[PDB]
Design a protein around this nucleic acid. Structure first.
Ligand SMILES: [Mg+2]
Ligand SMILES: [Mg+2]
Ligand code: NA
Length: 226
DNA sequence: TAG
């Protein structure tokens, strides 16, 4: 382009469940990362047919799915759709978002060939600023420091405009594949759904991602800590 | 406009 940050070598599909929506000062209850090398995406076969079948996930993938005890209760709305509550997370012995979690994420990211780019649906307004806020509370250094990120809503908008309607995760998936997504509002279900829409046009997605990746350190926290 |  020249590419502003070089080729993204690893795409990290990311999904968070949390206790509520942005004005509630929400906290994370579940986290899922799906790390895919760009080779896996460029090896995805072209989406043919109307509709095309849902693309097959790459064989080679690193996956991390974690349930996390938040510091405050879930809104009733959040619990009904995620199937999670703070109390039941604690009955199941889930720990808080803590320094160890940060050390876990860092080691997971370091397994990936660099640089890594986080991909989340509406990430620019939800997942990235939320995650930035969770990590901010920790005295521990951010494990996301040399990482990049993109919002898949912008990606799919550009990809479909390259070919009114909704750009919610489920809407896009149903429009592309004429099927309902499964396990919605679980971190891993919605991450796998996200993987599928991004595999719709894998080459165009990588190109767009390389051009719009931005440092996660420029992400503004969703809300302030004490 | 999209837990
Ligand atoms: Mg989400
Ligand atoms: Mg979800
Ligand atoms: Na393509």
């Amino acid at each position: 382009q020249t590419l502003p940050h070089g080729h993204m070598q690893t795409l990290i599909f990311l999904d968070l469940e949390a206790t509520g929506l942005p004005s509630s000062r929400p906290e994370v209850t579940e986290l899922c990362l799906l790390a895919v090398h760009r080779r896996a995406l460029e090896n995805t076969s072209i989406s043919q047919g109307h509709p095309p079948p849902v693309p097959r996930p790459p064989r080679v993938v690193d996956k991390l799915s974690l349930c996390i005890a938040p510091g405050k209760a879930c809104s009733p709305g959040a619990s009904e759709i995620t199937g999670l509550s703070k109390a039941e997370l604690e009955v199941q012995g889930r720990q808080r978002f803590d320094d160890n979690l940060a050390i876990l994420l860092r080691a997971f990211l370091q397994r990936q060939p660099q640089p890594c780019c986080l991909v989340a649906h509406n990430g620019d307004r939800y997942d990235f600023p939320l995650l930035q806020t969770e990590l901010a509370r920790l005295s521990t250094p951010s494990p996301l420091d040399g990482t990049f990120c993109v919002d898949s809503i912008a990606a799919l908008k550009a990809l479909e405009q390259a070919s009114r309607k909704s750009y919610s995760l489920g809407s896009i998936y149903t429009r592309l594949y004429w099927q309902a997504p499964t396990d919605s509002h679980t971190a891993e279900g919605d991450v796998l759904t996200l993987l599928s829409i991004c595999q719709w046009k894998p080459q165009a997605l990588l190109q767009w991602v390389d051009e719009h990746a931005r440092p996660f350190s420029t992400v503004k926290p969703m809300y302030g800590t004490p």
